[PDB]
Design a protein around this ligand. Structure first.
Ligand SMILES: *CC(=O)NCC1CCN(C(=O)[C@]2(Nc3ccc(Cl)cc3)C[C@@H](C)O[C@@H](C)C2)CC1
Ligand SMILES: *CC(=O)NCC1CCN(C(=O)[C@]2(Nc3ccc(Cl)cc3)C[C@@H](C)O[C@@H](C)C2)CC1
Ligand SMILES: [Mg+2]
Ligand SMILES: [Mg+2]
Ligand SMILES: [Mg+2]
Ligand SMILES: [Mg+2]
Ligand SMILES: [Mg+2]
Ligand SMILES: [Mg+2]
Lengths: 236, 5, 236, 5
């Protein structure tokens, strides 16, 4: 790997610089190099990893959606034939997206998840696993689509089971996991009622536990709770 | 699109 | 070149899709492939070329400035030594920026400029030449800095001489050239008075020629004139 | 930064 010669600490330092410079591809490459050193990641380091790849794939997803919409319009009655170029370029973007998702999944499988024993680390990685299978599912149209969707579901479910046993209802990781799994239900699994029920119960259970928190923890939890509320408002 | 984190 | 097997028209089509998807690196790679087919570019195609590389290098310049500011702060009295990482990563970004500028300059030299005979095409390419030497100058600190600055100046000056002979004072290419050359004077050549004089005379000469224009041409010219005014306001 | 096109 091209980062093999760079110190772990220098990779982390450079990932933080890359973030400041909004150079998210570089940030992701640095954090991939840091993961591949083989040591477990701290909380801060897990956050750098997640932010880098979230931003890289987020941009790919937005571009894929623009291209897929143009491609759909091209297949409507009365649309002039323009050749294979729209499909080819959507395929190009799609293949690069799938590559990034496979790279993240590969870091999680080799060997972040298996070394993560604390609930906060293990839930965080399993959530990432669900998220990157969800991004694969968004673009899947073949023989494996069902298996891809099930992979996402299984990862999210294991994370949920741990989170409910080991974390308080206000814990930001528990909250973020639930937010995303609720979106999975709505957008991927064709289960809007499940999505709504999960978002509502998560919100309500968190609300009831806010009284136990410091001001700073309250801020963290309520920020994510508002995203649950935002989704519920969109869906109801 | 709905919110995710 | 990896685009050698793709039709010219398909490259152009894909560059337009890439633009819609805000995929400016792809857009630039497509337009590089289109230039390398060897045929002259239409106005629309010159615009695709310019927009793609403007956006790619613009992002690199913004990142380079973030990194250079962190590096400067690191060299102030009482700043803790943090090792070579800030300089290395600024150097990495810088080298990639210089690479992009060398790629554009190479397209202009092989063979866009020498085949451009009409004033509108030749001025446009010579302006680009000045712009990409200006970006090289922004990051230059060595033996060649003076020669890099002079390369930018010479390209801009040839474009200006043609523009003043062959185009009306409201022509958008003439206006954009003058805007940029004025910035060159201010930011690169340490010639703020020249920058101000050029912006003011350009604006005033354009104003006097607006009466000759259609509504649509008036809109085009006045949009760029406002940028001249904005710079004058910043500088006075 | 000043405006360029
Ligand atoms: C190491 C660790 O415990 N990280 C969790 C931490 C919690 C606070 N936080 C956030 O709230 C945001 N990001 C995420 C990411 C992943 C998960 Cl599971 C939850 C939260 C970032 C802030 C800026 O914005 C909120 C909306 C989400 C960062 C990660
Ligand atoms: C082929 C050709 O003649 N192109 C010129 C054309 C003029 C109109 N225009 C612009 O005004 C803007 N871009 C540039 C780029 C380069 C030059 Cl020399 C002048 C103008 C784009 C629009 C959206 O915004 C204005 C401010 C600049 C596009 C290029
Ligand atoms: Mg070491
Ligand atoms: Mg495919
Ligand atoms: Mg349940
Ligand atoms: Mg051909
Ligand atoms: Mg250098
Ligand atoms: Mg003069």
């Amino acid at each position: 790997g091209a980062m093999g010669s760079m110190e772990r600490a220098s990779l982390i330092q450079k990932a933080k610089l890359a973030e400041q410079a909004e150079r998210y591809e570089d940030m992701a490459a640095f954090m991939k190099g840091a993961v591949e050193k083989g040591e477990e990641l701290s909380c801060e380091e897990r956050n750098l990893l997640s932010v880098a790849y979230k931003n890289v794939v987020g941009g790919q997803r937005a571009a894929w959606r623009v291209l897929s919409s143009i491609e759909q319009k091209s297949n409507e009655e009365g649309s002039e034939e323009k050749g294979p170029e729209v499909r080819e370029y959507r395929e190009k973007v799609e293949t690069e997206l799938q590559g990034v998702c496979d790279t993240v999944l590969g870091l999680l499988d080799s060997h972040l998840i298996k070394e993560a024993g604390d609930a906060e680390s293990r839930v965080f990685y399993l959530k990432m696993k669900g998220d990157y299978y969800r991004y694969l599912a968004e673009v899947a149209t073949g023989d494996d689509k069902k298996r891809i969707i099930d992979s996402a579901r299984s990862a999210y479910q294991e994370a949920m089971d741990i989170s409910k046993k080991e974390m308080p209802p206000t814990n930001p990781i528990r909250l973020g996991l639930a937010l995303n799994f609720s979106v999975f239900h709505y957008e991927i699994a064709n289960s809007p009622e499940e999505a709504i029920s999960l978002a509502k119960t998560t919100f309500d259970e968190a609300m009831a536990d806010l009284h136990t928190l410091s001001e700073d923890s309250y801020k963290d939890s309520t920020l994510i709770m508002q995203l649950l509320r935002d989704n519920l408002t969109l869906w109801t | 699109f709905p919110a995710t984190v």
